[model samples]
Target: RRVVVTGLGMVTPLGRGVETTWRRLIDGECGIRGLTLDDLKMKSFDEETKLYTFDQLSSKVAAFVPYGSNPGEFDEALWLNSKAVANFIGYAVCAADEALRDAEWLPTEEEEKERTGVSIGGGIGSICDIVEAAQLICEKRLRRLSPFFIPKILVNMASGHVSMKYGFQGPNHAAVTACATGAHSIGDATRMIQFGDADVMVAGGTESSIDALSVAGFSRSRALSTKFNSSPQEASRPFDCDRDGFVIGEGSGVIVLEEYEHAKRRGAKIYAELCGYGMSGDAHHITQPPEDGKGAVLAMTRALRQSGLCPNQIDYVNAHATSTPIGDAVEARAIKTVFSEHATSGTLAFSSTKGATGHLLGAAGAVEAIFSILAIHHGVAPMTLNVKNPDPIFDKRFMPLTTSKKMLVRTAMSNSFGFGGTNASLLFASI
Candidate 1:
């Protein structure tokens, strides 16, 4: 009845594959950069006439997926379906393919295929396509719309497409919990396998809404980092004194989770045992957590309880710090409350890799979970970047790491908080 991670795949702003991205992450390389509306090229009108320039938007930087024929870049012609699909769907397919291949789980038998499933989710799905459609409708060109438009904009379409591609016929699902989508997807998939609904499940999250509308909307809400446009890499400085806001990023991360005995029988390489998953709701605000971080406390407490591991036993923590002023401080307070003496003892290592990858939004939790697994896999804790001046609010013993450290990481906890006060925590341990 136990679930374990058998395969990991990612398409992040840092790189295309899990190893490539993980290497860059541990090296403290940043993936965020200056952005322009024309860079997206999702709309034909922007390419032809360049009418809608995003000059008024405050945030000019974002972490975009690298697209090219280079070593670690993504090529749409190679990864995407024959018919045009949304970027979210393409990302999901790419990550899922790599995950399945990594797990060596290409089933040929009918019963084997029937017991496999897919559960991928997205936060803001197909916004660029919707924008283009709105433009066409405004110009009275409704007839020119593609037949696949409806499917393209649906959030569940990512899971549908991935399942259809591999002929997986069990428990196809999706989650839409804002930034917590990835964690929820993986947690739900783990449950499906534990409950005997499926033997193998490909689960994670995808997000590709880094367009003019998405940026401008977040900018209007004052949720994006605008002060570091000139120095894009420093924009997502979590737990730093001068931190302003989060840098929006886009990507997908999917992992193959299997029943422990089933994976062992297949001789699959198990990365880590997914021992616990905890979820909670704030029930207070839509986009902000309570000052005391009671929701985050509940999520982590539930995960620790389910894991059956003492607070001192958790070696590392992949924090949900997004570099927002209030968010980072609140999460630290919650961690201190939960860990008590272990947190302030300076023995536990915890850092936010978002300092390097920027905020991947919906994909963040899944990607961070992979980082947590890798920390245990490699025995190295990836450090937080761009923290030149630490904030006074944090205890010196609990300060985010400035450099990667080599240590025996037996257990790791990855946290994710989203809009609508949704929170999820995943605990992974070396088996």
Candidate 2:
């Protein structure tokens, strides 16, 4: 009944492959950078008016995947094909391709296809595209909208297209739990395999809506960093007192997960065991985590309980710290609450790779989960970035600020709390 991660891949702002991103992350590189209104350009409908421009705004920074890599590029031939209809599908396809290849699973046989499945999702699915379509409709040119608009905007299509590409006949699943999309997708996929619903599952999340409307929306909500526009690399300063807001990030993170016995029988290379998947919600607020972080506490506690390990057993936590002011403090309090003794003993370690990757939103959980698994695989945790002055809420000694920590990481957890108070925690163990 055990599930193991057999293959991992990502098309992220940091890089295209997991190994490349991991290396750059450990080196303390920051992928977030400034963007302009021109970056949010949309084609105009009026024949006379050449373009419409907008004023400058704060939190104009975003982490975009350096889009030229093969198999992951934004080439119009494949990703822009009619069926995909959106960039997120292309991102998912690229990451899923790498993951399947990594697992050496190119199933042509019907038998092989029937037991494979895909679970991919994105938060605010196609927000930019939706806005574009609406604009076209407002111009009274409904006919101008591509016939693929609906499919392109559909939340489930990321998973559906992956299933279509590989002919996976098992569960074609998707999660749209705001920022928890990635963790919920992967955790749900693990359950599918654990419950004998599938022998293997391609699970993760993708997001690529750094467009003007998307960025403006988050900025309007005042949920993005405005203080570091000039210093984009220092924008996502999680666990720091001066932190403003999250830097919007775009990418996909995918993993090939299989039942343990099935994987071992096939001689698959197991990266880590998916020992626990836990989800919770804070009913107190729509956008803010409760000050006490009871929901976070419950989620982490459930993950540890399901993992059959106590709080002290966890070596490090790949935090869901999105450089948000309230969320970061809430999570720190939760960690302190759960691992009270270990937390105070200075034995508990944690870091938010988000400092390097920015906030992937829907993709954050799975990407950070992969980081945790790789931490176990490599015995090193990617460090926080730009935390010149650590927040007083967390112990600086355990923060791993701006430097990768070399340690024997056997167990780790990934925490993702999305808007609407939804949260998920994934526990991983080295085999």
Candidate 3:
């Protein structure tokens, strides 16, 4: 009933492939960039006048995947030929293909196909498509709407497309839990394998909601970084004294999870064993976590218990600190509470990868979990970029890594918390 990670794939704002993104991330390169009014492409733009709309809304920075024919870039023509799909679906397909290829799990036999499955989720579906559909409805052009519109806007279509593409007849499910979608998807898929529902499962999350409405809505909610608009690379400064808010990002991350015995029999290379998964709810606030971070502590403790690892045994933590002032402080306090002296004495190193890739929302947890596995595989811990001034909330001896370095990372934990008070923790260790 044990599960192991056989392959990893991602189409992040940092790059298209897992190694490419991880290399760039460890090198301290950032992917976020400033967005002009033209990038927003508001529906309220006046054709006659040169002026535009949404000039009042703040937070004009975002992390977007590179698109071109170059290596490591995402070329739409190379991945798909249809225009009815959204970028999130396209990202999910691309990442899933790479993961399956890496795992070498393509099966021609009907029995083999039926034993495989897929579970990919998204927090927000295609906002652009929804906006366009609304415009069509308002203009009384209901007949002009594309038949694929509904599929394009559905959060579960990412899973649907992957399943239909490869004819995976096993459990076809999706998790839609805000920012925790990625972790939930992976954890749920792992349980499926443990329960004997599937031998192999493709699981992760994708998100492409960098449209005008997403930005405007987050801006209105006061959850976006605004002070570093001119300096986009420095916008996502997690655990920094001057941190403002999170920078929105878009991408996909998928992993091939297989039963340990099946993978071992096939001579598959295992990256890490998914030892534990724990989830909880705050039931306190819709958009904010409690300042004490009790819910986060509870999740981490449950994961450690399931993993059979003591607090001091954990080497690295892929924190879910999204560069917000309050969120970062609360997570730091939670880590301190969970790890105790080990965290305060700096024996347990932790960093937030969001500084380099920005916050990929639903995809953040999966992408970060991959980074944790890689950290165990390569024995290197990535730094939290742009931490020029460390926040005072952390213990004086506890300093977030400002530069990547080689370390003995035997076990690692990845954390993800969502807007609806949902939280998930995943434990990965070398087997």
Candidate 4:
């Protein structure tokens, strides 16, 4: 059974729609910026107060999505009630609606009321909601918490709400594997269709944890970029010698996945086939990939084997290169290990679209998957930004950062590795 992408949607630092975001990525644009403690407006008495900056930290940088666009900006009223839909649900609903529209899936009266399913998750579900609720509890007791608090904050509610809004009665589940959540969610949804659990599955991930707590935690761990405050765009430097850390980013990416025969019967436009998926754990560290790139190799190799693809058959790779100094290099080495034997002519073309969209963490895979699919559809590979000088150790044959290039792509693989050593690689190909 073949599972193909019928539709795609994303809300990222680059833009709301997949088209806008994909254009920016191919152009190698950067969305990173700097932040100050005062800018964040942290409470003085809090323990995070020490981390607060009385004096601005100019070096500290982040890839932040501006809140200029609200949930109400999209067509939310059609799929969900305004009163019941909060920010998180509103975003998910809006993205899902766009995806269905993009897929041109106007379910028949029977289909609309039938057993369509949803599989979505967030990395750290609704941190802003929890923070605000906590503040309300401290200021006005637990009774003051919004009635919608529980529903909005639950990690699984994103999928649950979507199922309810569409009246989908099939499998409604969520996976929370930190950064790997998106890939796992999509992969699991594909399995559901493969096993005949559902005819159609709306699968993806959403995250909006760009709040004070998230920034503070990441900042304290020194995992976030802390440079170029004045010039925010140059902060995310992936696979470059001067790379620092990943800039925290948030958004949601949703895709409508359906079984091939079912989609063909409905005359749906198929984007690409979800041919292979590989998942593994390093068991080596919580936050850092192994120095040897063993886990990454395992994941990619498994994906290739599952797809029955030779190393030379993979035309492009959308890497999990989050612009971290070690993370990017490890992935480079992993690519080399897996594809080196077959790359006598030249290395495969690969790019990390995170340069433009920033790292959506759990949602990264979903949006990056959209980028990979677009690469196949458009015959262009997106550029990797902030790579003025590539890493000395990186194999340049495969890693192209400056410009989008044309290619006859047959298969493209996407890598998504999470904090707890959870990793997933997805292979997509044109049908």
Winning model by lDDT: 3
> lDDT for every model?
0.89, 0.85, 0.90, 0.77
- Write the residue-wise lDDT of candidate 3 on 225-320 in tens digits: 999988999999999998999999999999999999999998999999999898999889999999999889988998899989999999999999
Better of 3 and 4 by lDDT: 3
> Model 4, which residues run further than 4 Å from truth?
36-60, 66-86, 111-113, 342-344, 395-398
**TM-score of predicted structure 1:** 0.97
Question: How many steric clashes does model 4 contain?
Answer: 3
Clashes of 2: 0
Roughly what TM-score does model 4 have, to 2 decimal places?
Answer: 0.90
TM-score of 3: 0.97
TM values, all candidates: 0.97, 0.95, 0.97, 0.90
lDDT of 1: 0.89
* C-alpha RMSD by candidate, in order: 1.4, 2.1, 1.5, 3.3
Model 4, position 234, has a per-residue lDDT of 81
Better of 1 and 4 by TM-score: 1
| Model 1: per-residue Cα lDDT over 2-82, one tens digit each | 999998889999999897899999888999999875755545574434434567678988998899888888888877755
Flag the better candidate by lDDT, 1 or 2.
1
Better of 2 and 3 by TM-score: 3
After superposition, the stretches of candidate 1 with alpha carbons farther than 4 Å from their true spots are: 40-42, 46-52
